[PDB]
């Protein structure tokens, strides 16, 4: 139930502060400093990962037309075909939350700026669906941070 609530947590504060620049206005909510160490090694290695990956991405917004949250509720399941099943590891999960970064920058630009927040829920809804038992093997996102050091 908590494990959702952090990583959520951590996905809507990243997507937010990529969209718009700022770096929020209050701390986080409970089992906050580990969301904090999550964030400030997403805020390094997404920005690197975008930049490698402009091409693809900006591409495949190109194609995605998204428009507003019905289109939220309609990307999920590429969502989950480009993330599915096989490999699993750090830097897949990073570069889909990347995606999701790029995607809420793009929606704040079209004044959608609404639309970010379901954005981030379906992330985590497909984050936490597909990979919950590993989650919990790697104690959630300490082996993320400890991953990234
Ligand atoms: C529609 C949508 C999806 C989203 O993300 C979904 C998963 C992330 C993603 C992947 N990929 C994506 C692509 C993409 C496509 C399609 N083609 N190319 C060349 C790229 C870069 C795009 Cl454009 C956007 C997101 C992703 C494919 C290549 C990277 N990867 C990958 C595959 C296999 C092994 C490895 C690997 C290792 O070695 O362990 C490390 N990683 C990075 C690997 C992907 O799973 C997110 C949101 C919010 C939305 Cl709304």
Known sequence: DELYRQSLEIISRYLREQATGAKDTK?????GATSRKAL?????????????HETAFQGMLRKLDI???????????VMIHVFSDGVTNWGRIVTLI???AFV???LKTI????????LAESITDVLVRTKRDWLVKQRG?????????
């Open 27 to 31: 701390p986080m909510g409970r089992s």
């Open 40 to 52: 400030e090694t997403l805020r390094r290695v997404g920005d690197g990962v975008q930049r490698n």
């Open 67 to 77: 428009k507003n949250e019905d289109d939220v509720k309609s990307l999920s399941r």
């Open 98 to 100: 990347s995606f999701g």
């Open 104 to 106: 809420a920058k793009h």
């Open 111 to 118: 004044n959608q700026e609404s639309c970010i927040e379901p």
């Open 141 to 149: 996102w300490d082996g993320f941070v400890e991953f990234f050091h």
